[PDB]
Amino acid sequence: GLQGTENLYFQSHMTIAVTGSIATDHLMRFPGRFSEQLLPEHLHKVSLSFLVDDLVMHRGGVAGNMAFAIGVLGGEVALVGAAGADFADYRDWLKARGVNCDHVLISETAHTARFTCTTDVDMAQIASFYPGAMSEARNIKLADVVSAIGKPELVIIGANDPEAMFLHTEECRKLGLAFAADPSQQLARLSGEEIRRLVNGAAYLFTNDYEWDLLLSKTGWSEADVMAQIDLRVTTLGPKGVDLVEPDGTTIHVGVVPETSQTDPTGVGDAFRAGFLTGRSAGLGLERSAQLGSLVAVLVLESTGTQEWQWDYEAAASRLAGAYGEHAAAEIVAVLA
Amino acid sequence: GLQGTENLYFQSHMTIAVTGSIATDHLMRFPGRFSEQLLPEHLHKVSLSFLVDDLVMHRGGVAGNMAFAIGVLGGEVALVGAAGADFADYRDWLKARGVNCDHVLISETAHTARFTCTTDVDMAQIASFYPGAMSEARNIKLADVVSAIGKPELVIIGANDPEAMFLHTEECRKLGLAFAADPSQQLARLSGEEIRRLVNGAAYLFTNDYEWDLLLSKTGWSEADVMAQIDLRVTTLGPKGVDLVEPDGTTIHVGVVPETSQTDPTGVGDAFRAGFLTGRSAGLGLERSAQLGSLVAVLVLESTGTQEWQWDYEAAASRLAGAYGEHAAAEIVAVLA
Numbered sequence: 001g002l003q004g005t006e007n008l009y010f011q012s013h014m015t016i017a018v019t020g021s022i023a024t025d026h027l028m029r030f031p032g033r034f035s036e037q038l039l040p041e042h043l044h045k046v047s048l049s050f051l052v053d054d055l056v057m058h059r060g061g062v063a064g065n066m067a068f069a070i071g072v073l074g075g076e077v078a079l080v081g082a083a084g085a086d087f088a089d090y091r092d093w094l095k096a097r098g099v100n101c102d103h104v105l106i107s108e109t110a111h112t113a114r115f116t117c118t119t120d121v122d123m124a125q126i127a128s129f130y131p132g133a134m135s136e137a138r139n140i141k142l143a144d145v146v147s148a149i150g151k152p153e154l155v156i157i158g159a160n161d162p163e164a165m166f167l168h169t170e171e172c173r174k175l176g177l178a179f180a181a182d183p184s185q186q187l188a189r190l191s192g193e194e195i196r197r198l199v200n201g202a203a204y205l206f207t208n209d210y211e212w213d214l215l216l217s218k219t220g221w222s223e224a225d226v227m228a229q230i231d232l233r234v235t236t237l238g239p240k241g242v243d244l245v246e247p248d249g250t251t252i253h254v255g256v257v258p259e260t261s262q263t264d265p266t267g268v269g270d271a272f273r274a275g276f277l278t279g280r281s282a283g284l285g286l287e288r289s290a291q292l293g294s295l296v297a298v299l300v301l302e303s304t305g306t307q308e309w310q311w312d313y314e315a316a317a318s319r320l321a322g323a324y325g326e327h328a329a330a331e332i333v334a335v336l337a
Numbered sequence: 338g339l340q341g342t343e344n345l346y347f348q349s350h351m352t353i354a355v356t357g358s359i360a361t362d363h364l365m366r367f368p369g370r371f372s373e374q375l376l377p378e379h380l381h382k383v384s385l386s387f388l389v390d391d392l393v394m395h396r397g398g399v400a401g402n403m404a405f406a407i408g409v410l411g412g413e414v415a416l417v418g419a420a421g422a423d424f425a426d427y428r429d430w431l432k433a434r435g436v437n438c439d440h441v442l443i444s445e446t447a448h449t450a451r452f453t454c455t456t457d458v459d460m461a462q463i464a465s466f467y468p469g470a471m472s473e474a475r476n477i478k479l480a481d482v483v484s485a486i487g488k489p490e491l492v493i494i495g496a497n498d499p500e501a502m503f504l505h506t507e508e509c510r511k512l513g514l515a516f517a518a519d520p521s522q523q524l525a526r527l528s529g530e531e532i533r534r535l536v537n538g539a540a541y542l543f544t545n546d547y548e549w550d551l552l553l554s555k556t557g558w559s560e561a562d563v564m565a566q567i568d569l570r571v572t573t574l575g576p577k578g579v580d581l582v583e584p585d586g587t588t589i590h591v592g593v594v595p596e597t598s599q600t601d602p603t604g605v606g607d608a609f610r611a612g613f614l615t616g617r618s619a620g621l622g623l624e625r626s627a628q629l630g631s632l633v634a635v636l637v638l639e640s641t642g643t644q645e646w647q648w649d650y651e652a653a654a655s656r657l658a659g660a661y662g663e664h665a666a667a668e669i670v671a672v673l674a
């Protein structure tokens with residue numbers, strides 16, 4: 001009754017655009033411990049052959065995961081990445097949860113990227129990633145996306161074809177789009193200069209604490225050097241929670257939702273980021289948004305695959321209330337409706 | 338009219354029954370050296386994430402590989418192993434090459450086994466094997482196979498479901514079938530008692546030199562102890578060739594066919610065994626048979642996948658002539674054509 005129809009519709013098009021990998025995750029379980037059974041002698045002429053007792057294929061890719069979670073939580077999200085012609089079923093899966101997939105580049109030749117991962121009983125991982133169609137993400141122009149769906153409220157620059165990451169970030173700077181620097185695995189692979197090129201001007205920087213130290217080491221930046229380039233640092237601390245740090249040093253710390261199981265750590269970070277950014281878009285403060293992100297992250301930790309979790313108001317509210325109090329759980333549920 | 342009809346026909350029989358794994362091989366290439374970047378410090382908290390720049394899916398499994406090679410070379414072969422309902426195209430692939438697949442067990446529920454392997458530029462490997470339908474190989478009775486195709490000249494007991502390996506070997510002993518003990522990868526996993534149970538009474542023992550030392554260590558056997566249990570030992574020595582050793586110590590040594598490239602070592606041993614045993618079934622002597630096996634082995638070494646090589650009498654003859662002399666090449670081609 002009190003909504004301005006014109007202005008509400010005007011803003012409805014301001015989506016989150018998620019750029020990053022789109023993949024199939026081929027996940028296997030090793031019924032042992034890599035750290036214990038592997039010995040230093042096995043690394044000098046490497047020949048490893050693990051017997052695995054489980055194998056499942058699931059939808060994945062950092063951008064696929066984040067878009068799935070934003071869509072499931074009710075946000076407005078567009079998936080912007082490269083995949084192969086095999087993508088049809090994945091497309092239907094994402095569209096059924098509200099994800100705009102019109103601007104997924106479909107390669108004429110290459111298959112969708114593949115993440116192959118063997119996880120042991122202690123959640124340690126030995127994995128390989130095949131880019132396939134992901135390399136063609138460097139041919140996506142965010143200008144065309146904007147022309148089609150309008151200026152997004154935020155562009156997430158997740159792990160992707162590296163050249164696509166640099167081009168997307170620079171196009172955000174040029175078009176005045178707010179972006180979240182979420183380089184994740186590429187922090188292990190890029191040079192300090194390249195990383196600096198991904199961070200400058202970011203509305204958000206997302207890393208975990210290890211990745212934060214890695215970024216500082218490789219870039220040669222101090223923390224103050226980074227905070228001069230970004231509006232907010234979000235650093236996940238695993239079971240120790242998450243820090244949200246403004247440029248003036250103001251820090252908000254949020255604890256985690258305790259897990260009922262540690263099934264598979266794949267996609268936990270993606271899910272935290274998706275939940276946090278959905279909460280922020282929905283009007284929640286930094287602390288409440290991080291609390292939502294922590295819930296989604298633990299739901300991914302407790303399931304095999306990255307998009308196999310389920311959203312249930314009653315269970316979500318109960319776990320949020322247990323971790324953060326009934327008032328916080330109520331505010332979170334109130335914005336998600 | 339100088340042929341002895343009885344003995345001619347007596348020698349004419351050459352059916353080989355191949356037991357062992359049937360699989361799809363998911364092969365990837367790491368464009369670097371594991372040795373350059375994997376260090377003992379990475380064992381504390383194991384978390385490896387390789388970028389691979391090639392991914393292909395190929396027909397595989399040790400029994401599939403050996404049956405393919407025997408069929409391609411003109412031998413008489415039946416494939417005896419467990420697969421999944423996905424096996425249909427694989428079946429057509431093998432039948433088109435003369436392989437009898439009537440006695441492949443098709444699981445009602447499980448997928449064909451899967452070998453996932455990353456190989457670096459120095460041929461080092463990191464791999465995982467998911468048995469799936471392979472476990473159901475323990476339900477295959479060689480008595481039914483014999484009832485269908487008659488008493489084979491040889492049963493190859495290759496890497497398989499371990500219980501199936503034991504059941505097949507004991508059924509060969511009870512039914513009086515000559516068998517080749519080819520446990521290969523299972524030598525890394527079985528106990529000395531189990532290995533001894535696989536070797537006793539073998540017509541052939543096939544291993545590489547490392548596997549030979551491993552067998553001797555785990556079984557507690559000396560070489561003479563082994564030679565008292567088997568009719569012929571075949572020990573491959575990689576670039577140093579192959580030793581063929583009778584119980585009385587009589588040794589035939591054969592050098593290798595020089596390779597034109599070192600592309601992928603997966604299935605090279607399978608191919609040697611198949612070529613050697615086909616040559617023997619066709620009436621070639623030990624040396625000529627090992628020369629044929631060495632050719633097939635290098636053809637697999639030079640190609641991606643285990644069954645992607647091509648059999649061409651003229652190219653084969655030229656390489657055999659270069660390695661072993663025109664007389665040997667001619668004798669081999671004359672028997673196979």
Ligand SMILES: OC[C@H]1O[C@@H](n2cnc3c(-c4ccsc4)ncnc32)[C@H](O)[C@@H]1O
Binds near residue numbers: 025059186266387
């Ligand atoms: O966040 C979890 C998600 O990350 C996805 N992924 C896993 N490795 C990668 C890499 C990579 C690795 C070595 S070099 C580049 N790049 C881009 N996405 C990846 C995976 O598909 C999973 O669903």
Ligand SMILES: OC[C@H]1O[C@@H](n2cnc3c(-c4ccsc4)ncnc32)[C@H](O)[C@@H]1O
Binds near residue numbers: 399
């Ligand atoms: O010899 C090359 C062929 O061996 C096949 N293979 C690779 N690992 C195995 C294993 C195994 C591994 C760890 S525990 C048991 N078992 C049975 N076959 C295998 C593969 O499908 C390839 O085509």
Ligand code: NA
Binds near residue numbers: 265266267268304305
């Ligand atoms: Na998970």
Ligand code: NA
Binds near residue numbers: 602
């Ligand atoms: Na090969």
